[PDB]
Design a protein around this ligand. Sequence first.
Ligand code: HEM
Length: 291
Amino acid sequence: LVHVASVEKGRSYEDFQKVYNAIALKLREDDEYDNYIGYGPVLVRLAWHTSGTWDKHDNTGGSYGGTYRFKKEFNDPSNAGLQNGFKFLEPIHKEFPWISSGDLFSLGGVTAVQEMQGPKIPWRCGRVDTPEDTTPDNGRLPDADKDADYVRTFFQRLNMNDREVVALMGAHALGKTHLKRSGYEGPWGAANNVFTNEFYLNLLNEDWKLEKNDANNEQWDSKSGYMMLPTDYSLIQDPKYLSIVKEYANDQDKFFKDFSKAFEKLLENGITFPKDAPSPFIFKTLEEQGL
Ligand code: HEM
């Protein structure tokens, strides 16, 4: 199936900047969530999980149809906790009912990254809601207890290469694992609601110990109180991933640029943009607007 981007009728960059801004203002206001981490990280994860169901082989799943709004997908065990991001976005959608669900979930992620001081992420509109029966089955999102070979093979289905995978994984600077959600517990670093290359630095520089958490799963833990999932740790066990981890640990701008590209790409798999579609939008942050 072909999913052609269709601009919400009559809308242009200013309309979407208003949605951006409402997201960004609520991110600022609703600051208590998750022990004052705020909603940034879970909105980034929502954007990723609503995009990451895509299968390049048949164009099922992906961000286009906004199918997370249907119970099969919102109740995917892999999506445990993302209901908080959805609830955050609900008043946004009520204010701007014209935006499609896919456009709102993906824009939430863009807005969160940028408001957290991350790179600009160009964003295109035009996702169109598709019906309940287009919701992908559970099981398309990745397991965390696996090795580098798993990770690499997993991401081929999303048409991501080694650099794109390692870049995307840098989003694990953000937020934390929550035992009751995923069976893993702990943050990956100190700056977990500011977008930086800390994930790579911690991978390389902390003294990691392989421990079992209170859900009886193995994770890597440091004396600083940080953790890595087995799939995170795989990025320094595999020599190809390791090189790239070192690159991003040593060049914040490179990480930003590569993350931006990969994240836009992730959010756009599956979508065909007509030749005369608008160019991607680059939203101004609240700070850049003086808001
Ligand atoms: C091999 C791939 C990946 C695996 C196995 C994985 C797994 C996990 C797990 C287990 C959690 C913790 C969930 C919880 O307990 O709340 C998590 C959190 C998170 N992941 Fe991933 N992840 C992967 C890739 C990504 C990618 C590609 C991104 C986005 C670019 C991403 C962004 C996030 C964010 C932002 C959080 C924190 C959520 C929060 O604090 O609520 N992850 N991930």
